[PDB]
Every structure is written in structure tokens, then in C-alpha cells.
């Protein structure tokens, strides 16, 4: 649950059903391709997403709002910086399970088989 998650740990958390992914790039970036399973919440929307009521989150994002007690809420962008910003923001609002995939989408693409 440390502030950064590495790719090997992330791959095992995804295979076990224990991590949720959040692509914090813009909508036009995420629409062009993302890490499989990732929910797009652009970093500029993330504060409002974490503050809004659960039913409003479901309406806008078509997924269930995370809970403060969740583990392995993994944020990422393509090169680390927005993922870091998002992780810090989420932690600051009480999401102790927020972690940054610092290697980010470019590493994901680089290490994909």
C-alpha cells in the first residue's frame, strides 16, 4: 500500500481482482487507449469525483465510487506526473489506498508482451 506501485505488483493485483485502475489523463487521451480495465477520471475532475455523492459518481462514470477504506486504488497517466498529482489528491481526501503507478502508461506499453 505504499505511495508507488510497481508494474510486477500491479500485474498480480489485477490478476487477483485486488486493484482498481484510474486513468487520470484527459478523456481524449484515455479514449485512444488505456490500461485494460481502467476507469477514466481526468485529474481535473478527480476532486469533484471523490467529493460527489455515490449515485452522482455512478451516473457520471458508470462505475461505483471508491470507498475510503479501499486498497490498491491505482492512479496513472502516461509518464507519472498527473498520476502522482491524482494520488496525492486522493490521499489528501482520506483515500489511504491510493497509489501511483509511476512507470505509467508508456511503461505499460513498453513492457507489454
From Swiss-Prot:
Its main location: cytoplasm. The active site is at 77 (cysteine persulfide intermediate). It is found in: Cytoplasm, Perinuclear region. One of its GO terms (cellular component) is cytoplasmic ribonucleoprotein granule. It catalyses: thiosulfate + glutathione = S-sulfanylglutathione + sulfite + H(+); thiosulfate + 2 glutathione = glutathione disulfide + hydrogen sulfide + sulfite + 2 H(+). SMART domains: RHOD. Highly expressed in kidney, liver and skeletal muscle. Lower levels of expression in heart, colon, thymus, spleen, placenta and lung. Weakly expressed in brain, small intestine and peripheral blood leukocytes. No expression in the cell lines EFO-27 and HeLa, or the normal breast tissue cell lines MCF-10A and H184A1. Keywords: Cytoplasm, Transferase. It is an enzyme of class 2 (transferase). It comes from the Eukaryota. GO terms for biological process: sulfide oxidation, using sulfide:quinone oxidoreductase. GSS(-) is a potent inhibitor of TSTD1, since the presence of the sulfur dioxygenase (SDO) strongly increases the TSTD1 catalytic activity. Residues 15-113 form the Rhodanese domain. GO terms for molecular function: thiosulfate-thiol sulfurtransferase activity. Its EC number is 2.8.1.3. Thiosulfate:glutathione sulfurtransferase (TST) required to produce S-sulfanylglutathione (GSS(-)), a central intermediate in hydrogen sulfide metabolism. Provides the link between the first step in mammalian H(2)S metabolism performed by the sulfide:quinone oxidoreductase (SQOR) which catalyzes the conversion of H(2)S to thiosulfate, and the sulfur dioxygenase (SDO) which uses GSS(-) as substrate. The thermodynamic coupling of the irreversible SDO and reversible TST reactions provides a model for the physiologically relevant reaction with thiosulfate as the sulfane donor. This is Thiosulfate:glutathione sulfurtransferase. It comes from Homo sapiens (Human). The lineage of its organism: Eukaryota, Metazoa, Chordata, Craniata, Vertebrata.
